[PDB]
Amino acid sequence: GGYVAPKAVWLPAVKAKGLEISGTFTHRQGHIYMEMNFTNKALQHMTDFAIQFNKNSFGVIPSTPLAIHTPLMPNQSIDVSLPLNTLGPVMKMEPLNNLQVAVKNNIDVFYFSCLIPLNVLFVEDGKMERQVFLATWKDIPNENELQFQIKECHLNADTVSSKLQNNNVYTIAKRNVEGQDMLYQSLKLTNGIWILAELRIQPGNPNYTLSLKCRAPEVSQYIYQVYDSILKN
């Protein structure tokens, strides 16, 4: 039971000759999926479907041929599921998490863009052995620490750990000092990078100070973003 973004219109009919695409990525038992839904708003039929992914920043690629065996009918809307892995090729994309994508059919080829939510790149063995979290924490130079402000979040010490848990942010420790709880937490990217976090929760204060330490800190701004999304949703 992870966090999944609603379907977003990746490629609207008006652009792909009647082919319309709704999308969302999912992580389930550390296996990535592009959840689509195809709709032929056109008046031809659609056979010969393939999807191709551009190089991206986490080697993200489709792992099968697109799963679609019938022609798609004037008006038929159907769910696809595209399994993905990350053993694919790599190019620093900007935004770091952008997916440029070619979908094809008998009619033509439509290029469109969608953002991978990073959360679905959190592996399952991302919980740092406790020695390992501390040593690492002091290791990575504070120069290297970013801090974010989880604007208006109010959910408990206990509710925080558990959401992040489904989305594979694992709480290492929860300490309280002058009244403020401080969740010590770790996650890890499919490509191997650790993120370490200290979430700090106040008595009263509507915000939630998030601090990330990370070997490559360009990632951090995104972890923020989707810790955010989780905690809001």
């Binding site: 501390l134 924490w137 420790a173 300490r175 000092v177 403020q180 401080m182 010590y184």
Partner: peptide, 14 residues
């Protein structure tokens, strides 16, 4: 041991 350092090290970053 481990317990301690986390309090150690929390307290400090408060």
């Amino acid at each position: 041991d481990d317990d301690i350092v986390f309090e150690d090290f929390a307290r400090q970053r408060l």
